């Protein structure tokens, strides 16, 4: 219930960090993992904002007072939480550096953001689960139902007491950021993915795709939106790895709620089930993975680095398959 706020001692800490000069380097790089560094996460995340964007773009104060009532509105959930939303964030920052002028001052700033808010308040339930069962926010949305939730919640830390990062924009811009941020949250939609995939393939392939054209624009961006929520697929395979146990604990605790109401969950979701991890891997990966890092290459010849690491990926879990796994940690 309500909105939560951040303290002054956790903002203001925020405002002294200092980035190890070290990890300058590596936050450039697409495979660099943020785990072995969580103290530091607030302070990579305005790392990447002054980097992208300029020391100046936002008010000091009030991007901590941001940052940190965001990292509040993250729920302590296995896998849709605060480390989830720094990681698509500095994938986004990946892809935006290594195509910077692709992408105006408005659309970086709007898209970091967005891919920092993008979970915001999540439950760790699917829109699957939410309409089955009817819950209230799928009456109140009823399609990509958590997704405008996010979006709603977004708004609400926004209107916070000196946390709008926006304010100084025109009245124009500022909406058209507000506009950038809700297009971009409602594409980490993966039912919305497919179509979009599919469409930008065939603009792509037909030569149609032009980037001054705003449908096509937006149609990038969620493209870019989808590629850094799945980016766990991208790392190293440990890392990848290790991530998938945490989604799967998700998955598990809504299948253990969609027994109690009488009906089987999917085997995705049925954690007596474990068995069928393997080859439900190597099906997201041929049907979601491989193909958004296929046509994001295409489009944006330098993030071939993420369908190459996804590409390996794949090939380990064809491994699992194949009983080949040697020794794991957990
Ligand atoms: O939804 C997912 N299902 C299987 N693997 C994933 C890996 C990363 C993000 C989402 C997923
Ligand atoms: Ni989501
Ligand atoms: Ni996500």
């Not at 179509?195 to 054209?213: A, D, H, I, V, W």
């Not at 099906?283 to 590409?311: D, H, M, S, W």
């Amino acid at each position: 219930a309500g909105t939560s706020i951040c303290t002054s001692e956790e903002w203001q800490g925020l405002m002294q960090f200092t980035l190890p000069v070290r990890l300058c380097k590596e936050i450039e790089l697409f495979h660099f993992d943020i785990g072995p560094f969580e103290n530091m996460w607030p302070g990579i995340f305005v790392y990447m904002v002054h980097r992208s964007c300029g020391t100046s773009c936002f008010e000091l104060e009030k991007l901590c007072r941001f940052i940190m009532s965001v990292k509040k509105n993250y729920r302590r959930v296995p896998y849709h939480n605060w480390k989830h939303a720094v990681t698509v964030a500095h994938c986004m920052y990946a892809i935006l550096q290594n195509n910077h002028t692709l992408f105006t001052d408005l659309e970086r700033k709007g898209l970091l953001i967005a891919c920092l808010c993008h979970d915001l308040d999540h439950r760790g339930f699917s829109n699957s689960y939410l309409q089955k069962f009817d819950h209230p926010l799928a009456a109140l949305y009823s399609t990509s139902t958590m997704e405008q939730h996010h979006f709603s919640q977004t708004v609400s830390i926004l209107q916070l007491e000196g946390h709008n990062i926006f304010s100084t924009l025109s009245s124009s811009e500022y909406e058209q950021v507000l506009e950038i941020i809700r297009k971009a949250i409602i594409a980490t939609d993966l039912a919305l993915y497919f179509g979009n995939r599919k469409q930008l393939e065939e603009m792509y392939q037909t030569g149609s795709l032009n980037l001054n054209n705003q449908s096509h624009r937006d149609r990038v961006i969620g493209l870019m939106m989808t590629a850094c929520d799945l980016c766990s697929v991208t790392k190293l395979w440990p890392v990848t790895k290790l991530t998938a146990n945490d989604i799967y604990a998700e998955f598990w605790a809504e299948g253990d709620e969609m027994k109690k109401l009488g009906i089987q969950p999917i085997p995705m979701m049925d954690r007596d089930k474990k068995d069928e991890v393997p080859q439900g891997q190597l099906g997201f990966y041929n049907a979601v993975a491989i193909p958004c890092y296929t046509t994001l290459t295409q489009i944006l010849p330098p993030t071939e680095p993420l369908l190459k690491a996804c590409r390996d990926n794949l090939s380990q879990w064809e491994k699992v398959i194949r009983g080949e796994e040697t020794a794991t940690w957990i």
